[PDB]
Amino acid sequence: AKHPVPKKKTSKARRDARRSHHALTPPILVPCPECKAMKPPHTVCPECGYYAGRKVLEV
Amino acid sequence: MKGILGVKVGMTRIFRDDRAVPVTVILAGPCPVVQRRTPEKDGYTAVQLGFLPQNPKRVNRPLKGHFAKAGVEPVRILREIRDFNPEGDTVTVEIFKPGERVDVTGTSKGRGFAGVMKRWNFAGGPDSHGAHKIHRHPGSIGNRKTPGRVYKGKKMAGHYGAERVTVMNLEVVDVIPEENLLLVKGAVPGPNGGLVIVRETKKA
Amino acid sequence: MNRGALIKLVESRYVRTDLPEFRPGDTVRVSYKVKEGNRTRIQDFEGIVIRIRRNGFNTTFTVRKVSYGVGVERIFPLHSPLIQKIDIVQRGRARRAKLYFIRNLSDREIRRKLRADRKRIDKDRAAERAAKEEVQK
Amino acid sequence: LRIDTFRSSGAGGQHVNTTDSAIRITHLPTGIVVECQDERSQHKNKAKALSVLGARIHAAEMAKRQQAEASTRR
Amino acid sequence: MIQPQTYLEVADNTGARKIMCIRVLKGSNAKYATVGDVIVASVKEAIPRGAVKEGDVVKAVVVRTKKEVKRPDGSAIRFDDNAAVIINNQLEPRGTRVFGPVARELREKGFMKIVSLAPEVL
Amino acid sequence: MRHLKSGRKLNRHSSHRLALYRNQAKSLLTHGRITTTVPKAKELRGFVDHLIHLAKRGDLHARRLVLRDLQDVKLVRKLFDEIAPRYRDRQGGYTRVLKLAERRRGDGAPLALVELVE
RNA sequence: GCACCUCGAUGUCGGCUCGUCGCAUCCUGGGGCUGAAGAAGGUCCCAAGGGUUGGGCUGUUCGCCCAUUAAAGCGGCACGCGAGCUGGGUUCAGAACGUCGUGAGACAGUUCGGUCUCUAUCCGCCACGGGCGCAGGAGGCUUGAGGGGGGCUCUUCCUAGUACGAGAGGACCGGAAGGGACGCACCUCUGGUUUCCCAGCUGUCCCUCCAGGGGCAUAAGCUGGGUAGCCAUGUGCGGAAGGGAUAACCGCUGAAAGCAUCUAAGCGGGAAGCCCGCCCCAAGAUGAGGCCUCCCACGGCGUCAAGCCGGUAAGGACCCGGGAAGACGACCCGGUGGAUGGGCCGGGGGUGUAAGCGCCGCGAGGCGUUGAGCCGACCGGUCCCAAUCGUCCGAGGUCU
RNA sequence: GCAUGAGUAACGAUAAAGAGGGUGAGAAUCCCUCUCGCCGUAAGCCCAAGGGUUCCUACGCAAUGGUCGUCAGCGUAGGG
RNA sequence: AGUGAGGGCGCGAGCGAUAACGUCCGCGUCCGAGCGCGGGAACAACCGAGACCGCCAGCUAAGGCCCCCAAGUCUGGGCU
Ligand SMILES: [Mg+2]
Ligand SMILES: [Mg+2]
Ligand SMILES: [Mg+2]
Ligand SMILES: [Mg+2]
Ligand SMILES: [Mg+2]
Ligand SMILES: [Mg+2]
Ligand SMILES: [Mg+2]
Ligand SMILES: [Mg+2]
Ligand SMILES: [Mg+2]
Ligand SMILES: [Mg+2]
Ligand SMILES: [Mg+2]
Ligand SMILES: [Mg+2]
Ligand SMILES: [Mg+2]
Ligand SMILES: [Mg+2]
Ligand SMILES: [Mg+2]
Ligand SMILES: [Mg+2]
Ligand SMILES: [Mg+2]
Ligand SMILES: [Mg+2]
Ligand SMILES: [Mg+2]
Ligand SMILES: [Mg+2]
Ligand SMILES: [Mg+2]
Ligand SMILES: [Mg+2]
Ligand SMILES: [Mg+2]
Ligand SMILES: [Mg+2]
Ligand SMILES: [Mg+2]
Ligand SMILES: [Mg+2]
Ligand SMILES: [Mg+2]
Ligand SMILES: [Mg+2]
Ligand SMILES: [Mg+2]
Ligand SMILES: [Mg+2]
Ligand SMILES: [Mg+2]
Ligand SMILES: [Mg+2]
Ligand SMILES: [Mg+2]
Ligand SMILES: [Mg+2]
Ligand SMILES: [Mg+2]
Ligand SMILES: [Mg+2]
Ligand SMILES: [Mg+2]
Ligand SMILES: [Mg+2]
Ligand SMILES: [Mg+2]
Ligand SMILES: [Mg+2]
Ligand SMILES: [Mg+2]
Ligand SMILES: [Mg+2]
Ligand SMILES: [Mg+2]
Ligand SMILES: [Mg+2]
Ligand SMILES: [Mg+2]
Ligand SMILES: [Mg+2]
Ligand SMILES: [Mg+2]
Ligand SMILES: [Mg+2]
Ligand SMILES: [Mg+2]
Ligand SMILES: [Mg+2]
Ligand SMILES: [Mg+2]
Ligand SMILES: [Mg+2]
Ligand SMILES: [Mg+2]
Ligand SMILES: [Mg+2]
Ligand SMILES: [Mg+2]
Ligand SMILES: [Mg+2]
Ligand SMILES: [Mg+2]
Ligand SMILES: [Mg+2]
Ligand SMILES: [Mg+2]
Ligand SMILES: [Mg+2]
Ligand SMILES: [Mg+2]
Ligand SMILES: [Mg+2]
Ligand SMILES: [Mg+2]
Ligand SMILES: [Mg+2]
Ligand SMILES: [Mg+2]
Ligand SMILES: [Mg+2]
Ligand SMILES: [Mg+2]
Ligand SMILES: [Mg+2]
Ligand SMILES: [Mg+2]
Ligand SMILES: [Mg+2]
Ligand SMILES: [Mg+2]
Ligand SMILES: [Mg+2]
Ligand SMILES: [Mg+2]
Ligand SMILES: [Mg+2]
Ligand SMILES: [Mg+2]
Ligand SMILES: [Mg+2]
Ligand SMILES: [Mg+2]
Ligand SMILES: [Mg+2]
Ligand SMILES: [Mg+2]
Ligand SMILES: [Mg+2]
Ligand SMILES: [Mg+2]
Ligand SMILES: [Mg+2]
Ligand SMILES: [Mg+2]
Ligand SMILES: [Mg+2]
Ligand SMILES: [Mg+2]
Ligand SMILES: [Mg+2]
Ligand SMILES: [Mg+2]
Ligand SMILES: [Mg+2]
Ligand SMILES: [Mg+2]
Ligand SMILES: [Mg+2]
Ligand SMILES: [Mg+2]
Ligand SMILES: [Mg+2]
Ligand SMILES: [Mg+2]
Ligand SMILES: [Mg+2]
Ligand SMILES: [Mg+2]
Ligand SMILES: [Mg+2]
Ligand SMILES: [Mg+2]
Ligand SMILES: [Mg+2]
Ligand SMILES: [Mg+2]
Ligand SMILES: [Mg+2]
Ligand SMILES: [Mg+2]
Ligand SMILES: [Mg+2]
Ligand SMILES: [Mg+2]
Ligand SMILES: [Mg+2]
Ligand SMILES: [Mg+2]
Ligand SMILES: [Mg+2]
Ligand SMILES: [Mg+2]
Ligand SMILES: [Mg+2]
Ligand SMILES: [Mg+2]
Ligand SMILES: [Mg+2]
Ligand SMILES: [Mg+2]
Ligand SMILES: [Mg+2]
Ligand SMILES: [Mg+2]
Ligand SMILES: [Mg+2]
Ligand SMILES: [Mg+2]
Ligand SMILES: [Mg+2]
Ligand SMILES: [Mg+2]
Ligand SMILES: [Mg+2]
Ligand SMILES: [Mg+2]
Ligand SMILES: [Mg+2]
Ligand SMILES: [Mg+2]
Ligand SMILES: [Mg+2]
Ligand SMILES: [Mg+2]
Ligand SMILES: [Mg+2]
Ligand SMILES: [Mg+2]
Ligand SMILES: [Mg+2]
Ligand SMILES: [Mg+2]
Ligand SMILES: [Mg+2]
Ligand SMILES: [Mg+2]
Ligand SMILES: [Mg+2]
Ligand SMILES: [Mg+2]
Ligand SMILES: [Mg+2]
Ligand SMILES: [Mg+2]
Ligand SMILES: [Mg+2]
Ligand SMILES: [Mg+2]
Ligand SMILES: [Mg+2]
Ligand SMILES: [Mg+2]
Ligand SMILES: [Mg+2]
Ligand SMILES: [Mg+2]
Ligand SMILES: [Mg+2]
Ligand SMILES: [Mg+2]
Ligand SMILES: [Mg+2]
Ligand SMILES: [Mg+2]
Ligand SMILES: [Mg+2]
Ligand SMILES: [Mg+2]
Ligand SMILES: [Mg+2]
Ligand SMILES: [Mg+2]
Ligand SMILES: [Mg+2]
Ligand SMILES: [Mg+2]
Ligand SMILES: [Mg+2]
Ligand SMILES: [Mg+2]
Ligand SMILES: [Mg+2]
Ligand SMILES: [Mg+2]
Ligand SMILES: [Mg+2]
Ligand SMILES: [Mg+2]
Ligand SMILES: [Mg+2]
Ligand SMILES: [Mg+2]
Ligand SMILES: [Mg+2]
Ligand SMILES: [Mg+2]
Ligand SMILES: [Mg+2]
Ligand SMILES: [Mg+2]
Ligand SMILES: [Mg+2]
Ligand SMILES: [Mg+2]
Ligand SMILES: [Mg+2]
Ligand SMILES: [Mg+2]
Ligand SMILES: [Mg+2]
Ligand SMILES: [Mg+2]
Ligand SMILES: [Mg+2]
Ligand SMILES: [Mg+2]
Ligand SMILES: [Mg+2]
Ligand SMILES: [Mg+2]
Ligand SMILES: [Mg+2]
Ligand SMILES: [Mg+2]
Ligand SMILES: [Mg+2]
Ligand SMILES: [Mg+2]
Ligand SMILES: [Mg+2]
Ligand SMILES: [Mg+2]
Ligand SMILES: [Mg+2]
Ligand SMILES: [Mg+2]
Ligand SMILES: [Mg+2]
Ligand SMILES: [Mg+2]
Ligand SMILES: [Mg+2]
Ligand SMILES: [Mg+2]
Ligand SMILES: [Mg+2]
Ligand SMILES: [Mg+2]
Ligand SMILES: [Mg+2]
Ligand SMILES: [Mg+2]
Ligand SMILES: [Mg+2]
Ligand SMILES: [Mg+2]
Ligand SMILES: [Mg+2]
Ligand SMILES: [Mg+2]
Ligand SMILES: [Mg+2]
Ligand SMILES: [Mg+2]
Ligand SMILES: [Mg+2]
Ligand SMILES: [Mg+2]
Ligand SMILES: [Mg+2]
Ligand SMILES: [Mg+2]
Ligand SMILES: [Mg+2]
Ligand SMILES: [Mg+2]
Ligand SMILES: [Mg+2]
Ligand SMILES: [Mg+2]
Ligand SMILES: [Mg+2]
Ligand SMILES: [Mg+2]
Ligand SMILES: [Mg+2]
Ligand SMILES: [Mg+2]
Ligand SMILES: [Mg+2]
Ligand SMILES: [Mg+2]
Ligand SMILES: [Mg+2]
Ligand SMILES: [Mg+2]
Ligand SMILES: [Mg+2]
Ligand SMILES: [Mg+2]
Ligand SMILES: [Mg+2]
Ligand SMILES: [Mg+2]
Ligand SMILES: [Mg+2]
Ligand SMILES: [Mg+2]
Ligand SMILES: [Mg+2]
Ligand SMILES: [Mg+2]
Ligand SMILES: [Mg+2]
Ligand SMILES: [Mg+2]
Ligand SMILES: [Mg+2]
Ligand SMILES: [Mg+2]
Ligand SMILES: [Mg+2]
Ligand SMILES: [Mg+2]
Ligand SMILES: [Mg+2]
Ligand SMILES: [Mg+2]
Ligand SMILES: [Mg+2]
Ligand SMILES: [Mg+2]
Ligand SMILES: [Mg+2]
Ligand SMILES: [Mg+2]
Ligand SMILES: [Mg+2]
Ligand SMILES: [Zn+2]
């Protein structure tokens, strides 16, 4: 190894270009059949504690 | 040209004239024709074959209509045997005789991201005698200021297998029509359960 | 679509039944079809069964024995059509499934470690004396 | 005559490694061979190796002609 | 599965006992030699007043190997040693006795004398 | 590759990974329901299942086997005397895993609960 | 030789690794002449497709030698390759011999020792995605422009002991069989591994005193084995056949030039080479192609914009259960109208006779119950558990 | 003074963790309990140097802590 | 004041090998300082020509006039 090193400063254009993919995705969400509160799908509702009709855990 | 679709089921060996013979087994039959390719319509000759019956409760409307114009219940795979124009309606494993010779095509097993030793059989470095951390490494990849670049297609690590592979001139050891079975002497690319295509061989 | 059954089905036509049961440690005499230039005669081969590796029809077994000084191992397809028969020369009780370790024992030690399997010998004298009253009258 | 050129052995630094300064002249009819990596100059060595090879094929024939004369007298 | 440097017991009465393989005589660059194949070998040790002496370079043919040999009938065979018989340039045995079994492959490969002189062919 | 290999590694070596399953099996059989990272929850699902199923056999041999992993005489009794009855007419699947809607703050680990059934 | 770039640094031999190009060709292929009888050899021409071994000695390159071989080619690529490795050589400081010098020291003289720098920004290269485009939107199946890969060779036998030869030897043409290396794929066999699949064992600490077990001795304590998977030493298969155009070279017909001339018009033959043929990539082939099938008409504004808003259509994406797919993406299967993972059950397979009790022996133990007990992945079954319920996007087709 | 490399290398021994309960605006990281592992001629205990309040109590988290922090050899006061 | 490293080309000599983008002199020239403009594909010094600034005017030089690319697919006459 002989310590590779950037030959030129990266231009603002080229820096930001790289970050064209860095953008975040909004959380995917669904309404609870019970309390109609938004929540992530396939997870037990944190608001009312129901999943698949049943009360799973107590909120 | 003639050929059929099928699924690789596995290997064993049979005995024949007191010699053992390794075989891979292929479930071929049957295969309904779904469309023929004329030169008037398509500019070439081939037949689309159906294979493995499909749950209609999963077939969508464009797919269903193609299947109607055929007049055959839906199917999971559509593939063409080029320059094969079956006189009959459904292609059966019957199209092969014991003794014939076949080219088989399947997808090879998938090595994922593969070293230069597994992908290309490079020797790598010495397991001892001084080597600083290059035990499986590719060595030099070029010259110097001339050409000052790497050849296109230089052998390097990368994805290996999981690709179209055809093995030539396999002997048909045996066929078992009442099970739609096919016995081929040798090995056939890809895992069991995989799709395969069995063409009549091209070697004279 | 049983991939397995499909395979076992193919084999079924080639399966044997006639060969007798045996285990590692048993001494065994395989009469085998061989080729002398033109002809085909039977050669016997007899030694300790040092190993059986099962895989349905594809199961096989290794016999070890010494001849004229040199030790020899032979590996037989259990359903080989070249096996004419198999004789049980003697039965012994091994404490494990793979007996390669006897590769390095004096024929005295080999003898001391591999005692005769009385139970299975008794059963063997028991049976066959069993099936004999109908092979009669 | 076959002449071989190649890199000399031992001291010299940069230059001794990148310079085919060693000479090996093989006189074909007799199989007699000399080598010279004395000086840094390749022809200074070819000169020397041509000098020795000369003296050695001469001396080899003189001896032949000697134990012919010396043994025809016996 | 013999290769250069491999030692072998000599299974004859030429007077050698150990020879070390130095070349296998299949092909331009054959990796290993097996039963029925011919090797060039050096005599590494021998009994007094035998025909072959130590340091003789000789031809020989492998008759037994520790690596099991496969067979078309699906069988296989393996011995406890690697053995060979020294042979002349016409590939005939330079001895008059061979010792221990030899592998049936010798028959097919050609070596007929060796098979006769053998105590048992396996 | 990894083709057709079964079983998680969970960034632990063999000796630790096993203790992990046991210590989670202890806790689960103890409290009836626990909260863990989702992958641990899925491995543990089958591990507790098999021990419970052994208790359904009730015999001494079964008890001595289950002791090896649970190590607690007291706890094992609860399993045989109180948990196994509850399942005499149920073939496997004595356990269930449900994913939660909350991650951990400090490392963002997705959580899930694992519990015995009715 | 010169001193033109480089002394605010262009790391210098050999080895290893990976090669690629040249052809003045080492081998294989096709030829002419021969002091070519045949077999061989010599010399020259064409030909770069592929091939071109393993060791002893020395740091060696070179070279000698052993054993083979069809052959063991020669060169370029900073005498290719140290941000790829080595560091034996060379080229610091130690030390010694010979040697030169009064000396300090010195030596294309020799000898022993002697720090080789984790992070790749751009180009290049191997792989894999995201975006947009492909003037209606889709789901499939395809065409192959242009690329890539591959291309080696030997021995034996028949023809036939024939043609040839005094003999020794010994063919062309045509046909057959078995090899070496290399390539691709595979796990039936052979052979490895198989970090907890089974068993045995030592020490110690613990549970519970016995029995039985558990921890630790490695990140498996050790040992004997070992499925699936990944594998080579194992198995299959490959190079071709053939079509076309040619090179050197051999010819037909044929003038100029009454004859002759392979050529000036025209024709035939002819290489492991060329173009096809075989395998693989492939429509970002912006020259964005083709075929089958599906969806439909605008719901409203907007002059100048073929624009916009925004519900839907065929469909698609999201999330979830998974996957011989995989770094992540991607790809494939499945999501209750369900066998996708987990458990349970069966089969296969591994280990090799569990615990408990009974009997025998003072006992260590032995025998029986017993091929028992345990039993990853493989092949299947089973809704017991888990893929709940849902959400978002997506035409309404510009002009002659 | 501020960029680039770049949300990249690294987060300092591969002795190892898990769950429950509590506290709190906030908890993988604080407290309590059970389980697991590691050291044990030490990785335990006691002197001497050196360091100079780091000791105990209560309140507290901006910074220090390679993350977090309700915790601390950190901040404030009191005591010793 | 600066300069007292010059360089290329043509010609005349020495050295060199009637080698060198070689070296050393002599006459001239240009680059140096005209790496400003046209030509010679590209190109300090070869051909043309010495740029004070502006113009959507004109003539010529070298070199060119088939397309890239301005102007003759010009006109006679030969050769290959
Ligand atoms: Mg910006
Ligand atoms: Mg993203
Ligand atoms: Mg709802
Ligand atoms: Mg919410
Ligand atoms: Mg046909
Ligand atoms: Mg049909
Ligand atoms: Mg049909
Ligand atoms: Mg019909
Ligand atoms: Mg029909
Ligand atoms: Mg019909
Ligand atoms: Mg048919
Ligand atoms: Mg994979
Ligand atoms: Mg290679
Ligand atoms: Mg490397
Ligand atoms: Mg270049
Ligand atoms: Mg290359
Ligand atoms: Mg790479
Ligand atoms: Mg891939
Ligand atoms: Mg590949
Ligand atoms: Mg292929
Ligand atoms: Mg049928
Ligand atoms: Mg196969
Ligand atoms: Mg043909
Ligand atoms: Mg016969
Ligand atoms: Mg086995
Ligand atoms: Mg014996
Ligand atoms: Mg005795
Ligand atoms: Mg027994
Ligand atoms: Mg019997
Ligand atoms: Mg030379
Ligand atoms: Mg040297
Ligand atoms: Mg040089
Ligand atoms: Mg030089
Ligand atoms: Mg030079
Ligand atoms: Mg000198
Ligand atoms: Mg050979
Ligand atoms: Mg090989
Ligand atoms: Mg075989
Ligand atoms: Mg000889
Ligand atoms: Mg045989
Ligand atoms: Mg005999
Ligand atoms: Mg992989
Ligand atoms: Mg791996
Ligand atoms: Mg880890
Ligand atoms: Mg870890
Ligand atoms: Mg980690
Ligand atoms: Mg609780
Ligand atoms: Mg258990
Ligand atoms: Mg209890
Ligand atoms: Mg129940
Ligand atoms: Mg000068
Ligand atoms: Mg100059
Ligand atoms: Mg160096
Ligand atoms: Mg090498
Ligand atoms: Mg090279
Ligand atoms: Mg040649
Ligand atoms: Mg030739
Ligand atoms: Mg010739
Ligand atoms: Mg002659
Ligand atoms: Mg000549
Ligand atoms: Mg070539
Ligand atoms: Mg080439
Ligand atoms: Mg070559
Ligand atoms: Mg070598
Ligand atoms: Mg060497
Ligand atoms: Mg050496
Ligand atoms: Mg030398
Ligand atoms: Mg050499
Ligand atoms: Mg030769
Ligand atoms: Mg050599
Ligand atoms: Mg080269
Ligand atoms: Mg050179
Ligand atoms: Mg070189
Ligand atoms: Mg050079
Ligand atoms: Mg070179
Ligand atoms: Mg090198
Ligand atoms: Mg280096
Ligand atoms: Mg180097
Ligand atoms: Mg070096
Ligand atoms: Mg040395
Ligand atoms: Mg040195
Ligand atoms: Mg150095
Ligand atoms: Mg020293
Ligand atoms: Mg020194
Ligand atoms: Mg002096
Ligand atoms: Mg002196
Ligand atoms: Mg010298
Ligand atoms: Mg000297
Ligand atoms: Mg030392
Ligand atoms: Mg050293
Ligand atoms: Mg050092
Ligand atoms: Mg160092
Ligand atoms: Mg760049
Ligand atoms: Mg990749
Ligand atoms: Mg990838
Ligand atoms: Mg791809
Ligand atoms: Mg893309
Ligand atoms: Mg993205
Ligand atoms: Mg458009
Ligand atoms: Mg397609
Ligand atoms: Mg193409
Ligand atoms: Mg093409
Ligand atoms: Mg091609
Ligand atoms: Mg090619
Ligand atoms: Mg090629
Ligand atoms: Mg050969
Ligand atoms: Mg012949
Ligand atoms: Mg024939
Ligand atoms: Mg004959
Ligand atoms: Mg004769
Ligand atoms: Mg004769
Ligand atoms: Mg005659
Ligand atoms: Mg024929
Ligand atoms: Mg022939
Ligand atoms: Mg042939
Ligand atoms: Mg093997
Ligand atoms: Mg195995
Ligand atoms: Mg113990
Ligand atoms: Mg213990
Ligand atoms: Mg006890
Ligand atoms: Mg315990
Ligand atoms: Mg412990
Ligand atoms: Mg263990
Ligand atoms: Mg064993
Ligand atoms: Mg083992
Ligand atoms: Mg083990
Ligand atoms: Mg094993
Ligand atoms: Mg296995
Ligand atoms: Mg081999
Ligand atoms: Mg192979
Ligand atoms: Mg082959
Ligand atoms: Mg031509
Ligand atoms: Mg005429
Ligand atoms: Mg004429
Ligand atoms: Mg004529
Ligand atoms: Mg011609
Ligand atoms: Mg003509
Ligand atoms: Mg023609
Ligand atoms: Mg022609
Ligand atoms: Mg012609
Ligand atoms: Mg032709
Ligand atoms: Mg050709
Ligand atoms: Mg070519
Ligand atoms: Mg490609
Ligand atoms: Mg395509
Ligand atoms: Mg394709
Ligand atoms: Mg396409
Ligand atoms: Mg596209
Ligand atoms: Mg299209
Ligand atoms: Mg919408
Ligand atoms: Mg996935
Ligand atoms: Mg998915
Ligand atoms: Mg993945
Ligand atoms: Mg399931
Ligand atoms: Mg069902
Ligand atoms: Mg099972
Ligand atoms: Mg069973
Ligand atoms: Mg079993
Ligand atoms: Mg036990
Ligand atoms: Mg018992
Ligand atoms: Mg069993
Ligand atoms: Mg069993
Ligand atoms: Mg398991
Ligand atoms: Mg369910
Ligand atoms: Mg459910
Ligand atoms: Mg749903
Ligand atoms: Mg909405
Ligand atoms: Mg318009
Ligand atoms: Mg920064
Ligand atoms: Mg930054
Ligand atoms: Mg980030
Ligand atoms: Mg991060
Ligand atoms: Mg990185
Ligand atoms: Mg760092
Ligand atoms: Mg660090
Ligand atoms: Mg990192
Ligand atoms: Mg809690
Ligand atoms: Mg703490
Ligand atoms: Mg503990
Ligand atoms: Mg503790
Ligand atoms: Mg102690
Ligand atoms: Mg001490
Ligand atoms: Mg310690
Ligand atoms: Mg203390
Ligand atoms: Mg103090
Ligand atoms: Mg301090
Ligand atoms: Mg303070
Ligand atoms: Mg505070
Ligand atoms: Mg305060
Ligand atoms: Mg703070
Ligand atoms: Mg804070
Ligand atoms: Mg820190
Ligand atoms: Mg404080
Ligand atoms: Mg205060
Ligand atoms: Mg105090
Ligand atoms: Mg002055
Ligand atoms: Mg002045
Ligand atoms: Mg001056
Ligand atoms: Mg100057
Ligand atoms: Mg001047
Ligand atoms: Mg001048
Ligand atoms: Mg000039
Ligand atoms: Mg001039
Ligand atoms: Mg002159
Ligand atoms: Mg001259
Ligand atoms: Mg001149
Ligand atoms: Mg000149
Ligand atoms: Mg000249
Ligand atoms: Mg000049
Ligand atoms: Mg001059
Ligand atoms: Mg002048
Ligand atoms: Mg100018
Ligand atoms: Mg001027
Ligand atoms: Mg300039
Ligand atoms: Mg100018
Ligand atoms: Mg110009
Ligand atoms: Mg020019
Ligand atoms: Mg210039
Ligand atoms: Mg110039
Ligand atoms: Mg210019
Ligand atoms: Mg200038
Ligand atoms: Mg001019
Ligand atoms: Mg002029
Ligand atoms: Mg004028
Ligand atoms: Mg004008
Ligand atoms: Mg003029
Ligand atoms: Mg003019
Ligand atoms: Mg022009
Ligand atoms: Mg122009
Ligand atoms: Mg124009
Ligand atoms: Zn809710």
Coordinates of C-alpha atoms (C1' of nucleotides) in Angstrom, one line a residue, chain B residues 8 11-13 35 37 41-42 44 48 58 60-62 65-66 69 76 78-80 82 109-113 118-119 123 130 132 138 140 142-144 146 150-154 156-157 159-160 164 166 168-169 186 190 192 203-204, chain G residues 10 12 17-20 77-78 80-81 84-86 124-128 141-144 183-189 230-231 235-240 278-281 290-295 315 324-327 333-335 337:
Chain B
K8 CA -34.6 -31.3 -13.3
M11 CA -29.5 -37.8 -10.1
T12 CA -28.8 -41.4 -9.5
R13 CA -27.1 -44.2 -11.4
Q35 CA -48.5 -20.3 -30.3
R37 CA -44.3 -18.6 -35.1
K41 CA -46.3 -13.4 -39.0
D42 CA -43.0 -13.5 -37.2
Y44 CA -38.9 -17.0 -38.3
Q48 CA -44.1 -21.5 -27.9
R58 CA -53.5 -16.0 -10.5
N60 CA -54.3 -12.0 -15.4
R61 CA -56.3 -10.7 -18.3
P62 CA -53.7 -10.2 -21.0
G65 CA -56.5 -14.0 -23.6
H66 CA -53.3 -15.4 -25.1
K69 CA -56.7 -18.0 -28.6
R76 CA -46.7 -21.3 -15.6
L78 CA -43.9 -20.1 -21.8
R79 CA -40.7 -20.9 -23.8
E80 CA -40.0 -21.3 -27.5
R82 CA -36.7 -22.5 -32.3
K109 CA -26.2 -22.5 -9.7
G110 CA -25.5 -19.1 -8.2
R111 CA -22.2 -18.4 -6.5
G112 CA -23.0 -14.8 -5.8
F113 CA -19.9 -12.5 -5.7
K118 CA -13.4 -19.7 -7.8
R119 CA -14.6 -17.7 -10.8
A123 CA -3.5 -19.5 -8.5
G130 CA 6.4 -14.1 2.9
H132 CA 1.6 -9.9 3.0
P138 CA -5.3 -11.6 -8.6
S140 CA -0.9 -7.8 -11.4
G142 CA -1.7 -4.6 -16.2
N143 CA 1.6 -3.4 -17.5
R144 CA 2.8 0.2 -17.0
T146 CA 2.0 1.5 -21.9
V150 CA -6.8 -2.4 -18.3
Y151 CA -7.9 -4.7 -21.2
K152 CA -11.7 -5.0 -21.7
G153 CA -12.8 -8.3 -20.3
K154 CA -9.9 -8.7 -17.9
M156 CA -11.6 -10.2 -12.3
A157 CA -13.8 -11.1 -9.3
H159 CA -20.8 -12.5 -9.9
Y160 CA -20.4 -16.2 -10.9
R164 CA -27.7 -19.6 -19.0
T166 CA -26.0 -25.4 -22.2
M168 CA -23.9 -30.6 -25.4
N169 CA -24.4 -34.2 -26.6
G186 CA -24.4 -37.0 -17.4
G190 CA -28.7 -25.8 -12.1
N192 CA -33.3 -29.6 -8.9
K203 CA -23.4 -32.3 -32.9
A204 CA -23.3 -34.6 -35.9
Chain G
rU10 C1' 9.9 8.3 -13.2
rU12 C1' 16.3 -0.5 -9.2
rU17 C1' 0.7 -13.6 -10.0
rC18 C1' -1.9 -12.1 -14.1
rG19 C1' -1.3 -11.6 -18.8
rU20 C1' -1.6 -9.3 -23.7
rC77 C1' 4.7 -4.2 -23.4
rA78 C1' 9.3 1.6 -18.4
rG80 C1' 5.2 -5.5 -18.9
rC81 C1' 3.8 -6.2 -14.0
rG84 C1' -0.3 -6.5 -6.9
rC85 C1' 3.2 -9.8 -3.4
rU86 C1' 8.1 -11.3 -2.5
rG124 C1' -9.4 2.1 -16.7
rC125 C1' -11.3 -2.7 -15.4
rC126 C1' -14.9 -6.8 -13.0
rA127 C1' -19.7 -7.1 -11.2
rC128 C1' -24.7 -4.9 -9.5
rC141 C1' -42.9 -14.3 -25.7
rU142 C1' -39.2 -13.0 -29.0
rU143 C1' -35.7 -11.1 -33.7
rG144 C1' -30.0 -10.7 -33.5
rG183 C1' -12.6 -25.5 -20.6
rC184 C1' -17.8 -25.6 -18.8
rA185 C1' -21.4 -28.0 -15.7
rC186 C1' -22.7 -31.4 -11.9
rC187 C1' -22.8 -34.3 -6.6
rU188 C1' -25.4 -40.4 -8.7
rC189 C1' -20.7 -43.0 -7.4
rC230 C1' -20.3 -25.9 -0.9
rC231 C1' -16.5 -29.2 -3.3
rU235 C1' -19.0 -37.7 -13.1
rG236 C1' -20.8 -35.8 -17.6
rC237 C1' -19.8 -33.0 -21.8
rG238 C1' -16.8 -29.8 -25.1
rG239 C1' -12.7 -28.6 -29.3
rA240 C1' -15.9 -30.8 -34.1
rC278 C1' -21.3 -24.3 -31.9
rC279 C1' -21.9 -21.8 -26.7
rC280 C1' -22.9 -16.9 -24.1
rC281 C1' -24.1 -11.4 -23.7
rG290 C1' -41.0 -7.8 -33.8
rC291 C1' -45.3 -11.2 -32.6
rC292 C1' -49.7 -12.8 -29.2
rU293 C1' -53.0 -11.0 -25.7
rC294 C1' -55.3 -7.0 -22.3
rC295 C1' -57.2 -1.8 -21.0
rG315 C1' -51.9 -3.5 -14.6
rA324 C1' -29.4 -23.7 -4.3
rA325 C1' -31.4 -15.5 -5.9
rG326 C1' -28.3 -12.2 -3.3
rA327 C1' -22.9 -7.4 -0.4
rC333 C1' -41.9 -18.1 -5.3
rG334 C1' -45.8 -17.4 -1.9
rG335 C1' -49.3 -14.0 1.1
rG337 C1' -59.3 -18.7 -2.7

